[PDB]
Amino acid sequence: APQQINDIVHRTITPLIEQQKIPGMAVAVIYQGKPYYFTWGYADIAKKQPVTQQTLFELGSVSKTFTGVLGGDAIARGEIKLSDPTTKYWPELTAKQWNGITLLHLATYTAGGLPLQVPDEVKSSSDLLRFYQNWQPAWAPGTQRLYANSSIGLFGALAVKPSGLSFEQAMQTRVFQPLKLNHTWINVPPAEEKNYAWGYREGKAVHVSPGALDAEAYGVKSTIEDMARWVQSNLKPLDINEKTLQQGIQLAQSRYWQTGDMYQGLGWEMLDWPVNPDSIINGSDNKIALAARPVKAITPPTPAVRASWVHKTGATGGFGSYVAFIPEKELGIVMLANKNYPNPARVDAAWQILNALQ
Ligand SMILES: *[B]([O])([O])C1=[C]N(C2=[C][C]=[C]C(Cl)=[C]2)N=[C]1
Numbered sequence: 576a577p578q579q580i581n582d583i584v585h586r587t588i589t590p591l592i593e594q595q596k597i598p599g600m601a602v603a604v605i606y607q608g609k610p611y612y613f614t615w616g617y618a619d620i621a622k623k624q625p626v627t628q629q630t631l632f633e634l635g636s637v638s639k640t641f642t643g644v645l646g647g648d649a650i651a652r653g654e655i656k657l658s659d660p661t662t663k664y665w666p667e668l669t670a671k672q673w674n675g676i677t678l679l680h681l682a683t684y685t686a687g688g689l690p691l692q693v694p695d696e697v698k699s700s701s702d703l704l705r706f707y708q709n710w711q712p713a714w715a716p717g718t719q720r721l722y723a724n725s726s727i728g729l730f731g732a733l734a735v736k737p738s739g740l741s742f743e744q745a746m747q748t749r750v751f752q753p754l755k756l757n758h759t760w761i762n763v764p765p766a767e768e769k770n771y772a773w774g775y776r777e778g779k780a781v782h783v784s785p786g787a788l789d790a791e792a793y794g795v796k797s798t799i800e801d802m803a804r805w806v807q808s809n810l811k812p813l814d815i816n817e818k819t820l821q822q823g824i825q826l827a828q829s830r831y832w833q834t835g836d837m838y839q840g841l842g843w844e845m846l847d848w849p850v851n852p853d854s855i856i857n858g859s860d861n862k863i864a865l866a867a868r869p870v871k872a873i874t875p876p877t878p879a880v881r882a883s884w885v886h887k888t889g890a891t892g893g894f895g896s897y898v899a900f901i902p903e904k905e906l907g908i909v910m911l912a913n914k915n916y917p918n919p920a921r922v923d924a925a926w927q928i929l930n931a932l933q
């Protein structure tokens with residue numbers, strides 16, 4: 576644990592915890608490929624349980640990066656094609672607005688205005704079919720980006736259909752297991768509940784509730800160790816022995832669309848490195864991140880660029896996560912907290928850390 580890393584991590588994170596009133600936090604820095612871990616505070620305030628390297632946190636939409644890689648793996652397996660019509664995997668989706676909407680559009684939030692959330696009222700699967708059949712696009716496919724659970728969540732559910740596996744089984748067998756992510760879960764087993772931190776929202780202990788497409792869009796929980804290993808795998812996909820998974824990772828980092836200075840991957844989002852920090856910091860604010868923006872198609876997509884800042888923010892009601900890494904520098908960071916605090920503070924802290932080490 577080189578002093579440089581200790582100092583820049585503590586110097587940045589300590590004031591962040593104080594300003595944001597974060598109950599508990601874990602951080603991993605991957606430096607020259609090796610991880611270094613840091614923890615603070617409480618996984619469970621009431622029971623006085625500290626955050627440790629084994630504490631599980633809700634990753635919220637960092638889960639989209641696993642969905643994107645799992646889709647990538649299914650493409651590499653020849654099970655699906657991003658050019659396939661959505662209706663190929665969901666024949667019951669007969670309404671005319673779906674003509675021309677492909678798995679690519681679903682995966683990348685470009686279908687034409689699918690909403691951020693699946694409505695709470697959608698409880699059953701027939702409820703889900705009804706919702707997509709009745710949905711009216713505001714825009715032609717592949718013209719505008721609108722960040723959306725109903726978009727990538729459906730991509731993840733359709734991507735695994737040819738396998739015949741449930742989404743959770745596919746994720747476990749094809750992604751978590753090969754990568755030795757043995758403490759990463761879509762559903763936290765009872766044996767691991769001791770380690771599951773509470774999230775804190777207005778002072779109240781909370782965990783994410785069940786919802787439609789939850790597993791696919793925001794439902795993964797993980798430890799700081801497994802998340803460092805996730806970053807290592809995404810930094811260096813060529814060390815992964817399972818061919819389709821290596822390829823899936825690279826596909827998730829390809830650049831499909833551009834809006835402003837960001838590129839949309841599958842789950843991952845990327846900018847050219849060196850980045851302008853105001854651009855990623857201000858860009859992470861939900862006033863920008865969640866807004867409808869015109870996109871330019873990248874035809875064909877650019878393969879994973881090593882000189883990139885590759886990142887994803889994640890939140891649930893009680894948790895705030897961030898992952899960012901730079902392949903060409905063998906450098907990355909994971910920040911997991913059990914309070915959903917503002918995105919720009921996450922990115923500001925991550926850039927201050929990675930910049931000092933780069
Ligand atoms: B993502 O973190 O940007 C994201 C997560 N969610 C979410 C979290 C909990 C419940 C529900 Cl319904 C949605 N939306 C966006």
Ligand SMILES: OB(O)c1cnn(-c2cccc(Cl)c2)c1
Nearest residue numbers: 650657826829830875876877878
């Ligand atoms: O030659 B290109 O740069 C190229 C070839 N294939 N792709 C690509 C990228 C991402 C996803 C898919 Cl299905 C194909 C880019």
